Amino acid sequence: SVPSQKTYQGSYGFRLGFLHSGTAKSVTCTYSPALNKLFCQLAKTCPVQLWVDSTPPPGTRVRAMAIYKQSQHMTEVVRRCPHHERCSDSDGLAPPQHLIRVEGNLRAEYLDDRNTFRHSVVVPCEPPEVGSDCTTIHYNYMCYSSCMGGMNRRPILTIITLEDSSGNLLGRDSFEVRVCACPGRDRRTEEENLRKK
């Protein structure tokens, strides 16, 4: 099977937001609205904002999962490559096979789905801090898009779902991801390729 990627704001008006980090050579994470695509370096902080129009109930959670973007690969589980799954870079909580980690949240839970074998990471919703209007989750991507025997240059999407306490769907959003050495240059190149076309 294949997880849905349909954008769904749901009853709470759920959607993502991204910072405006620019495309300088030194940037470590940068989001392209024109491409709906995040470009980031390996194992660097990726801030993803969560926005709602109304407060979801206590016990609501936010899950992240990666799938391959191309239809001919969508049934394959996205996982870390044979090198990175063995490199002993564990944070004590994420299984070494998982591509997506949450940084700095001891309540993150990592799921290996017993039926689909897909990986995901889920955290409890927490309201914005005083003086803020949204909540931010910090994700890390633990393989390059190019890693041989893993993503192997195939594009991926990240699907972010807002879920109730039983795991039922409340909202969904998504974005493409490229994990690469020079996200600023790659964002500029791909936005130029989208122009021209």
Ligand X SMILES: C=CCOc1cc(C(=O)O)c(O)c(I)c1-n1cccc1
The binding site for Zn(2+) consists of: 81, 84, 143, 147
Q: Does 17 sit near ligand X (CB under 6 A)?
A: no
Task: Report the residue count for the chain.
Answer: 197
User: 156-188 burial, b if ≥16 CB within 10 A, otherwise e?
Assistant: bbbbbbbbeeeeeebbbbbbbbbbbeebbebbb
Structure tokens that stand for 81 in this block: 């490559």
Q: Does 96 sit near ligand X (CB under 6 A)?
A: no
Q: Does 129 sit near ligand X (CB under 6 A)?
A: no
Asked if 107 and 123 count as a contact pair (C-beta separation under 8 A), the reply is yes
Task: Give residues 58-77 in contact with ligand X (rule: CB under 6 A).
Answer: 58, 60, 62
Structure tokens that stand for 176 in this block: 């493409």
Q: Does 128 sit near ligand X (CB under 6 A)?
A: yes
Q: Does 98 sit near Zn ion (CB under 5 A)?
A: no
At position 5, the amino acid (one-letter code) is Q
Residue at token pair 């990666």:
66
Structure tokens that stand for 159 in this block: 């699907």
Q: Does 78 sit near ligand X (CB under 6 A)?
A: no
Nearest alpha-carbon partner for 38 in 119, 134, 192, 157: 157
Nearer to ligand X, 78 or 121 (CB): 121
Structure tokens that stand for 33 in this block: 């609205």
The stretch among 56-64, 101-109, 140-148, 185-193 that binds ligand X (CB under 6 A) is: 56-64
Least CB distance from residue 179 to Zn ion, whole Å?
Answer: 9
Q: Does 143 sit near Zn ion (CB under 5 A)?
A: yes
Task: Give residues 132-151 in contact with ligand X (rule: CB under 6 A).
Answer: 134-135
Residues that bind Zn ion (CB under 5 A): 81, 84, 143, 147, 150
Residues that bind ligand X (CB under 6 A): 50-52, 55-56, 58, 60, 62, 125-128, 134-135
